Amino acid sequence: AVVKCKPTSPGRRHVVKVVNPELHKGKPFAPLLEKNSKSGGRNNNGRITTRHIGGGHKQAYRIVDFKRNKDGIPAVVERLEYDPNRSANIALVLYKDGERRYILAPKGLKAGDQIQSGVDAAIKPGNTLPMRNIPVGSTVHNVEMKPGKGGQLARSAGTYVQIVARDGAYVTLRLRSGEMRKVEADCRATLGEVGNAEHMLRVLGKAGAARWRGVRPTVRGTAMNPVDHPHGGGEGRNFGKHPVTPWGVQTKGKKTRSNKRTDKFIVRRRS
Amino acid sequence: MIREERLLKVLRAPHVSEKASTAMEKSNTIVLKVAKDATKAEIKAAVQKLFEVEVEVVNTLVVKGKVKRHGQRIGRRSDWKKAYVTLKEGQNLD
Amino acid sequence: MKRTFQPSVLKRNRSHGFRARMATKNGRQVLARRRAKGRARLTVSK
RNA sequence: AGGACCGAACCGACUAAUGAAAAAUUAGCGGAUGACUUGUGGCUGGGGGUGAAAGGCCAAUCAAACCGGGAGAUAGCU
RNA sequence: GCUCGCCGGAAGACCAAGGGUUCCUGUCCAACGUUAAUCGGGGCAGGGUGAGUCGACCCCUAAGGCGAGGCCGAAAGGCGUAGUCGAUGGGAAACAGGUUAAUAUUCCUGUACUUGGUGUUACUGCGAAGGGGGGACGGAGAAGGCUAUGUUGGCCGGGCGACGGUUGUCCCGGUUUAAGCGUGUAGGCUGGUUUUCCAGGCAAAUCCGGAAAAUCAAGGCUGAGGCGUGAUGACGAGGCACUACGGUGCUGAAGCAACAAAUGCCCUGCUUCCAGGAAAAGCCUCUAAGCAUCAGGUAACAUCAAAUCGUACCCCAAACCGACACGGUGGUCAGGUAGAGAAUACCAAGGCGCUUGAGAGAACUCGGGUGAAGGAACUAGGCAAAAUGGUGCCGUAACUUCGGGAGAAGGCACGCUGAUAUGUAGGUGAGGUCCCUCGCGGAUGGAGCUGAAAUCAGUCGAAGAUACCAGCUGGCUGCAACUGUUUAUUAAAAACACAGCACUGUGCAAACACGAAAGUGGACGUAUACGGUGUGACGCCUCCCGGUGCCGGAAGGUUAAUU
Numbered sequence A: 001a002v003v004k005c006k007p008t009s010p011g012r013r014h015v016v017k018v019v020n021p022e023l024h025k026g027k028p029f030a031p032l033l034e035k036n037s038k039s040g041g042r043n044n045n046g047r048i049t050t051r052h053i054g055g056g057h058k059q060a061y062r063i064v065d066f067k068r069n070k071d072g073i074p075a076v077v078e079r080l081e082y083d084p085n086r087s088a089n090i091a092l093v094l095y096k097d098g099e100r101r102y103i104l105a106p107k108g109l110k111a112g113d114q115i116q117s118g119v120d121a122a123i124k125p126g127n128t129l130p131m132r133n134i135p136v137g138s139t140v141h142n143v144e145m146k147p148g149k150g151g152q153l154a155r156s157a158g159t160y161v162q163i164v165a166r167d168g169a170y171v172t173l174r175l176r177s178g179e180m181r182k183v184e185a186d187c188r189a190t191l192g193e194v195g196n197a198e199h200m201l202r203v204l205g206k207a208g209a210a211r212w213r214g215v216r217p218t219v220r221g222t223a224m225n226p227v228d229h230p231h232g233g234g235e236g237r238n239f240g241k242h243p244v245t246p247w248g249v250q251t252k253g254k255k256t257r258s259n260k261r262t263d264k265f266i267v268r269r270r271s
Numbered sequence B: 001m002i003r004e005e006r007l008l009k010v011l012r013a014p015h016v017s018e019k020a021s022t023a024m025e026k027s028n029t030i031v032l033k034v035a036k037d038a039t040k041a042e043i044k045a046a047v048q049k050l051f052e053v054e055v056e057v058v059n060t061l062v063v064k065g066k067v068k069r070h071g072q073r074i075g076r077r078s079d080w081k082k083a084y085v086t087l088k089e090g091q092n093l094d
Numbered sequence C: 001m002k003r004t005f006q007p008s009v010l011k012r013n014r015s016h017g018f019r020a021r022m023a024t025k026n027g028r029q030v031l032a033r034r035r036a037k038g039r040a041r042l043t044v045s046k
Numbered sequence D: 001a002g003g004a005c006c007g008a009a010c011c012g013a014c015u016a017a018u019g020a021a022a023a024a025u026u027a028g029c030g031g032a033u034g035a036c037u038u039g040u041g042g043c044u045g046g047g048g049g050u051g052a053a054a055g056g057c058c059a060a061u062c063a064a065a066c067c068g069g070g071a072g073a074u075a076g077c078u
Numbered sequence E: 001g002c003u004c005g006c007c008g009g010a011a012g013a014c015c016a017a018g019g020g021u022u023c024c025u026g027u028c029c030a031a032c033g034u035u036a037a038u039c040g041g042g043g044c045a046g047g048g049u050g051a052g053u054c055g056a057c058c059c060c061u062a063a064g065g066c067g068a069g070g071c072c073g074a075a076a077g078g079c080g081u082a083g084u085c086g087a088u089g090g091g092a093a094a095c096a097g098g099u100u101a102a103u104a105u106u107c108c109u110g111u112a113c114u115u116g117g118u119g120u121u122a123c124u125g126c127g128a129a130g131g132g133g134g135g136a137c138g139g140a141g142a143a144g145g146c147u148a149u150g151u152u153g154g155c156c157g158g159g160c161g162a163c164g165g166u167u168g169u170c171c172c173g174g175u176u177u178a179a180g181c182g183u184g185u186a187g188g189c190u191g192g193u194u195u196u197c198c199a200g201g202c203a204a205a206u207c208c209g210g211a212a213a214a215u216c217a218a219g220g221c222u223g224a225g226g227c228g229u230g231a232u233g234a235c236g237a238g239g240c241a242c243u244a245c246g247g248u249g250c251u252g253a254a255g256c257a258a259c260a261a262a263u264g265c266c267c268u269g270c271u272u273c274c275a276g277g278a279a280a281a282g283c284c285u286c287u288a289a290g291c292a293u294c295a296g297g298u299a300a301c302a303u304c305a306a307a308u309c310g311u312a313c314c315c316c317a318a319a320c321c322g323a324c325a326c327g328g329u330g331g332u333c334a335g336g337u338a339g340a341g342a343a344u345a346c347c348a349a350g351g352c353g354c355u356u357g358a359g360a361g362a363a364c365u366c367g368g369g370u371g372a373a374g375g376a377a378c379u380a381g382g383c384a385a386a387a388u389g390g391u392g393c394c395g396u397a398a399c400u401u402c403g404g405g406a407g408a409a410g411g412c413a414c415g416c417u418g419a420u421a422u423g424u425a426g427g428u429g430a431g432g433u434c435c436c437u438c439g440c441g442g443a444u445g446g447a448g449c450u451g452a453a454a455u456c457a458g459u460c461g462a463a464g465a466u467a468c469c470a471g472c473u474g475g476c477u478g479c480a481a482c483u484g485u486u487u488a489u490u491a492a493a494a495a496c497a498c499a500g501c502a503c504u505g506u507g508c509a510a511a512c513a514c515g516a517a518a519g520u521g522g523a524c525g526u527a528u529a530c531g532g533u534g535u536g537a538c539g540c541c542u543c544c545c546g547g548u549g550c551c552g553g554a555a556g557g558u559u560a561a562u563u
Helices: A197-201 A207-212 B004-010 B018-027 B040-051 C009-016 C018-023 C025-037
Strands: A002-004 A016-018 A074-081 A090-095 A100-104 A114-116 A128-130 A139-141 A161-167 A170-174 A180-184 A188-191 A266-268 B011-014 B029-034 B055-063 B067-070 B073-076 B080-087
Touching (some): A016 A197, B004 B011, B011 B040, B018 B029, C009 C018
Antiparallel strands (some): A139 A188, B011 B029, B055 B080
């Protein structure tokens, strides 16, 4: 649930927590963990390639299963867990054969729930099956774009995709953006919405919170000198130019999709 | 097994000093100048063969060379290896 | 006042020492130049 | 509980008067569980870096570092 | 040498880094030392650094570096796989005393430990580049148990006072002892043991994981400290022999108890929070290829082994970074009295008086003290000074986002003595007595020890938070919500940032960015996400598309290479 924190200090006043009690209070499943060091938004050349990334808390990498290939073995959900690497919550499941995996926790899922991958599997939340097997009109998440690859669409805290149509070897998805997109019908997909839907109701409430999430501050181009950004300079507050990136490209409105290889799959762009 | 020839080369001199004398008298320990490359075992071997005397143990150390000045010109003395060799009880050395 | 030079031997060696110089072409060139000049201390190496 | 409060260390540098000091002093002053501070090592290189943005900082050097070279640049000027 | 003064969370002690002989001894005083110098971190000579257990090396890895092939690139070269390097992190082992002019966990004395071989007898499934476990981990908070350490008493040794008193409820000193081995406690974690099966752990697995079934409620792991031993020893106040006045040799009493007590240890624990908290080896275990009655494994016992390099000295500084014998510099140690305290004051241990002195006692300058009457009249401005300043209790407005405002404001009490109470409330807790699955056990018991706070009564002073230490307060108002950041060295702000808001791009080989490219970041993220732009908490809110941009359109006009 969302919880507005009492204003016992400024910087706590405007804080709203999203507190789920059903998460695992404990150390995560250590076999599925692995190291994940921070970039600082800097590439192999050592240059900053993406501004405003830096610091934040140490995090392990939970190895989430997005491919979801244990066909026919029924799994049972052991627990829901906090993943620092994503807006969703993950769920530690236990297959009948003794293997454990992390998956994206879907909306209704909780400890004890049984889930299943495969063509044969029951059309119920958390179950995973090819989109030719999934009924049209259903909400799905963790959608593969290429068969066998692993789920790429609808992974974020409260997302889901609608299967609007199945026309032969393809199905048309209504993506969360509003883009309609053709996808091969043999591509896999998990039933239902992804879990942590009140994630968006959280409000950080102070500068420090942002920092804790590894986000360094962002300086406004207009606050700079002309040598630094296109918006810089001016005595007092001036801004007599069309908005643009730090590299001079228009920012308010100018489209930047150039991919002519996948234009065929996009049925309708978002609006 | 150290070679005879090697052994002969190892041991450079006896070291005369107050401390050395004290060591000799009280602790039955002789203070030698040895080759800088000479390991402890080798030194011990040399002592045993060349002075005919049982060795309890060898402690070594490297003495660093002093920097000196001959007139205006600066110049460093050589480093050299000192060895305290403790002889077994009752071993009297000439 | 914390002055600019704050010595550290390992750091010095890694930065400027012989092996570092050797490692790259430009470093090598520098060494060569030094040699040509007649430098006694070819590198920072003690 | 807290980018909560008072306050030493520690980090800073608002007022003051005053070479030992190429930016310090003494007296007060701000922060002091954090967007804190600090050791060691690492990475980013010059129209390049880095910048909670002052054209700041990049070895007492910065509206384009230093070293060497083109080079005895050119100087209707002194 | 005797006084005096200063530091004492340091101006003391021990290290790292850095330096590199500055250490110690003798000797010399030209230069160096802001003066003199017999002295010196100066000159010259000699001496000095001892390790299986400390550190490096070594084994393991992090960020990152290099990188066979490889991919990419006019050349140079870039990126990167296998790998291999890389500590600031993980990995076996030593303590006490004694000694040098100068080293010591390194020498000596005592008492220990480790992991390797080799050989043994005893046994008999061993075996990895692989599987599993483990190592292995955050912040904050709270205690409880402890010790370091200190205080008092007891004990032991010495003392009987340069001036009134001082054979006592008097004075001074000491009262120390390790690792190791044994015990396995306060306490923490977990249900164990056996059997059966199984699409999992790249193959196999007797291991792990998962299913069942049986049976027993104690099983195991962890763990400070204490106690015992170690120790008939060592050390020991000071006494006693020699004396090159440096010291050397002999000798040696007591060596207990209580209370207080860490920020250290149990604690890598527990509780809790969200921001969700390295890796790999050593270590344990499982098997595969294999070998097969051999090796290898564990078992004690014997023996051999542990090389190499560092070890002086300075290390908040006269030895390092600052041209100087001139501010900066990470870690560890942390006594007493007062105190909340690592603040402050005075002291201990220990270390220093800052390498020019001597006079004088003008103006003026610096740093301080006090000041009649007035009290901001000063001045751009109360700048600077002055003042306020503690604990407890009473009391406290507007306005408010209901948290605040607030330590609002303002007041009262405060010492010492006695009594309450030859020391209370509390804290601690010995004998005795009882129980007992027997121990570091449980009950009862209260000796002794420690010990606030208050009330009443008296009492001294001008003054009792007496020194040091230690808020000035209130009223109206601009700006920025707030904590933060910034021009190293004339600007700390109203500037930047900020949570929040909006627009806009981006469907994943994402947009975008760094790269002739390969590739990398974005992100092991996927539209509740990421980028860019503006605005800047919260509250109430927020006409013009003609111009310039952007978005969409494509009928016509115009329009490149090409032909």
